[PDB]
Amino acid sequence: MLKLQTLQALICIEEVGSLRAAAQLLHLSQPALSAAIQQLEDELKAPLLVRTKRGVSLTSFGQAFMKHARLIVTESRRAQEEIGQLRGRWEGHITFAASPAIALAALPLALASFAREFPDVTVNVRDGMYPAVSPQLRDGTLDFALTAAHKHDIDTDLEAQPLYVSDVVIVGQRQHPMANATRLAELQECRWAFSSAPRGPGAIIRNAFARYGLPEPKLGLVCESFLALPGVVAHSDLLTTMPRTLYERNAFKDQLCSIPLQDALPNPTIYVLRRHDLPVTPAAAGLIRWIQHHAL
Amino acid sequence: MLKLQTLQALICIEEVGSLRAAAQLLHLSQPALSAAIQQLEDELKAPLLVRTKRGVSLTSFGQAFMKHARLIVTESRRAQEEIGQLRGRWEGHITFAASPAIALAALPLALASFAREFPDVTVNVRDGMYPAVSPQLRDGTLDFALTAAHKHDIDTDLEAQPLYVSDVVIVGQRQHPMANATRLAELQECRWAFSSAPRGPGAIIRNAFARYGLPEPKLGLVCESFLALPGVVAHSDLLTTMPRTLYERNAFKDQLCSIPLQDALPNPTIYVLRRHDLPVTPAAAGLIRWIQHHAL
Amino acid sequence: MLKLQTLQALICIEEVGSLRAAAQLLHLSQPALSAAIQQLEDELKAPLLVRTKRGVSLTSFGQAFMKHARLIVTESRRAQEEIGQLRGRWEGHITFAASPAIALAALPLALASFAREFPDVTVNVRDGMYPAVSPQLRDGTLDFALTAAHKHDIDTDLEAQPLYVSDVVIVGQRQHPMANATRLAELQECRWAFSSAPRGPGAIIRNAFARYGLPEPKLGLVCESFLALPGVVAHSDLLTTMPRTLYERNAFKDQLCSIPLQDALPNPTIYVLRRHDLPVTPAAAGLIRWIQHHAL
Amino acid sequence: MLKLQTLQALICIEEVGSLRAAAQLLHLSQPALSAAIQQLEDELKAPLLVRTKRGVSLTSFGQAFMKHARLIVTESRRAQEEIGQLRGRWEGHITFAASPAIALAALPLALASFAREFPDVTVNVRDGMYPAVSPQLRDGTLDFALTAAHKHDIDTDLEAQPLYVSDVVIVGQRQHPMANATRLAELQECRWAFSSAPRGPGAIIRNAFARYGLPEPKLGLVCESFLALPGVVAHSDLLTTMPRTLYERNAFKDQLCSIPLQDALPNPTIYVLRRHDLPVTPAAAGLIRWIQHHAL
Numbered sequence A, B, C, D: 001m002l003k004l005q006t007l008q009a010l011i012c013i014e015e016v017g018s019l020r021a022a023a024q025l026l027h028l029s030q031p032a033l034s035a036a037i038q039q040l041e042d043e044l045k046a047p048l049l050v051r052t053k054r055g056v057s058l059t060s061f062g063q064a065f066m067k068h069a070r071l072i073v074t075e076s077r078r079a080q081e082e083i084g085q086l087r088g089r090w091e092g093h094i095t096f097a098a099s100p101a102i103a104l105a106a107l108p109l110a111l112a113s114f115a116r117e118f119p120d121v122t123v124n125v126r127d128g129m130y131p132a133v134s135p136q137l138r139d140g141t142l143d144f145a146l147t148a149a150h151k152h153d154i155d156t157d158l159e160a161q162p163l164y165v166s167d168v169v170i171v172g173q174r175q176h177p178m179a180n181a182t183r184l185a186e187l188q189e190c191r192w193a194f195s196s197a198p199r200g201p202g203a204i205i206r207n208a209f210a211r212y213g214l215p216e217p218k219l220g221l222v223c224e225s226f227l228a229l230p231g232v233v234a235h236s237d238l239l240t241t242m243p244r245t246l247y248e249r250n251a252f253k254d255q256l257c258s259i260p261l262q263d264a265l266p267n268p269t270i271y272v273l274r275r276h277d278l279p280v281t282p283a284a285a286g287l288i289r290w291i292q293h294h295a296l
């Protein structure tokens, strides 16, 4: 029998004056409790209980021992309470960073379902992108990030689980002069709103231009806000690249077009990124499952 | 004495985090980047970098030195760009942050106007809010921030110029239970998505509930991403506050509504914020001009 | 519920810092130490250990849990030792700390007396001072501390029993410039070696200079090691305060002197300090008895 | 010419109205300064100075540029001041741990000499031993430790430089019954005051007994305080092992003897131990040199 339940029982035996009565009160087996106390007495080499007409009393050794017993039972309760609070604070909070596409499609449906399965968790959500999220993942102020990355180029401190394979489209003002282009080379003369990517401003379009044999793309401006990007392109002649989800869910849809090229653009893999030494909360894993569920 | 040429070296080394990865400073001929840092370390008489687990890391001295290094480098660049501008050679950089209400309405029109008049100025557009923008204002890495703020509580070294008086609304899913509420008191029991604000996450609804005599609003989640907010609200029963301009310009407009409230809500003033003792380049001035104009 | 058997396992694992190095728990047959920790982790519902750079490290939960684990294990051991003692079987452990004035005079005589009467009790003797000893008093890892303290400023859960009223002297190199000073004011310009004390390093000379109307004493060095103090003073012109007993009993007595001062200095009371709610084992009681006796 | 001295000169030129006068004031070469300003003007593509009858004035471009120049000169001064303070605090403090032998012989003479060569450094000295010092060396609260260790068994985070090779002697009460022993086996019947060592209480004597084919040494008591050890052995029949320096410099010399065995005891190597990522202060290295100097 678990020692703490034995000590707990002795505490009860002191108050109600019977082994039998104590076992029934704490829902323990009489023959098991009796054998536990006996075992303990043999280890102690003294009796804790002396019989009377009514029941039992603590012996002299029993009274000495009970002071220790009382402190051990109390310490156990306090320990479980301290850690219950600390763990309660831990499990009750999630802080993460999401890419624009996850935030526009996956997250909203994920968050609804999640909050039913995990009703007691505050979630804190922010915009984020790798490599910028790396330092706060590392220093712990950020639990995980849901962001694009390149497998062969990720921090070693970080674990990376693929979430889904994403799409990138070239976007322009609805009647862009190059709306009918089928090739990258046909856009050499356009100016670009360099959108953000793991390898730097406009890295996706620069690298596309490079592999297809073209010079550097002509810069129009650098637009790091994905919130601002769709309207900016709508009121200018600048082209940009963006996630398909952003193109499909933005405020300026009817003023924009995509320019679908027969030349291939990349498919940025979206990753769960977190520090690997770190333990993941049940809720954190839960939220990931739900976002995953809506990223199929 | 310091060698201003080495400051960008240090800046670069802290960013890429590697000894060798820094060689893209066009030191693809020699590791005399080390000699350059040796000098800087002796001028300050303190170790700046440190042999580390994944490559190279700044010491506490290095970290302290960065804000000064960055202000020096960016002020030098601004000095040079200004002189050319004063000669009608309109080249150079502008980096600025914008709140969602500026970013979705005035900004697209202003950027296009500016680019037409100043075709060769490289502009960098970011999300940003006060007070988070303050340290990038302070080290010269942002020229200005277009953000909500409270006049009576802006840091002393910051210049604040009123740009726009914005409008707060209360937003929920289209067939929300409270869709037809007209009083703040009717929303007492609702769960909220705390959106970002100068005085902290959810400060607007928190401070409103307070003034209207209510208890703390009930937290559903913290959502710092304005890109994510409309959709989160669309696919749940969470209420939120948001700029009217965002309410009117998002991808989930069909699935949302604004609560027809007859209790009044705040009208946050959007400001142009700058570190006051920094002379504004003629080009940056030119852009603020345009944002003001389109801000109506 | 907790399994008290696993607590020593956890204790051991945190000390040796290794997964496998812990197998000296006589688990040289199986890694079912892991199963034991799995249970504990589930009882607390929190990760306790963490896969780490050099082996295994406690999580913040593990760290929080240690004081409770240690008090439980040591109270259980004390419960068992007491019972045997109450039966005239004088076996078990005593761990205690002592200040230099107790350690150099009363302690040698007391330990010898005690060992003659209680030949089989294992005694553990440590340096220690208040308040540094407090957390080891609190977690049961020290049975008592014999230390200077101030009555009006001892933590509430600590029992404090006057043992000895000690004597402070001011000590310097034998032919010190001030060797013949009779007034504290004459030592105003001297450099001091700050020795340890309850109110902080050099608190005695600091608080003396203050009461006698002087400015802050001049710091030469901080010397927490009483073993080192006499020699440091012997081979320099640094003055220090120290217990008269230490002044009288060190290896550099020939090369030292005490300043023949007619301004009075404090007489720190040495106390027997214990966490008050912990029942003192008969053996430990037996030793405190002897230390008291020899303390004269 | 260093750019900061150029900007500094332009600041001077604005105030005193002459290039010639400014070069002489700041002790710079006229032909060099003139060429520097010229070079700067060519890069700026505008003149900073216009001639008058007296001297020069800033041009319009000069006045624009000077605002930036003034800020860059000021920032440089502030940077050097911030880091000068931080580094000043760093270089002006040493905190270390010493073994009993170092503290009794090396340190006192080291500290005197050191403090002349490095007069502005607070030194904080404490008792310490490996492995106990390891966590605070690692977390930085302790600069270095001068302690015994075993080369083939030291933490990887730590660098270890040998300081000197030490001696261990068996010590007893002046007329110990075993004072004439020449072999370890002759002491099998004695009881020991287990003194502290890297591999645990009494590890030196246990391991000596083991290699010479003997059973475990009989325990008398565990004495972790090296301050207490000599008097404890003097007023009992317990034997101990200790550093030769402790045996030669303690308060109870005339009441003790050594028991020099023809059996060999170990020669514990004393190490400088520090975290290797950490930069060492000039003063810290200096103190080590002086302790080294007195450990020959």
Ligand SMILES: O=C1O[C@H]([C@@H](O)CO)C(O)=C1O
Pocket (backbone or CB within 6 Å): A149, A150, A197, A199, A203, A204, A205, A207, A266, A267, A268, A269
């Ligand atoms: O910068 C780049 O953009 C794509 C990337 O999006 C693929 O995921 C790619 O291969 C690059 O080199």
Ligand SMILES: O=C1O[C@H]([C@@H](O)CO)C(O)=C1O
Pocket (backbone or CB within 6 Å): D149, D150, D197, D199, D203, D204, D205, D207, D266, D267, D268, D269
């Ligand atoms: O514990 C031991 O004591 C000596 C050591 O002092 C040598 O430096 C040794 O070899 C052991 O195994």
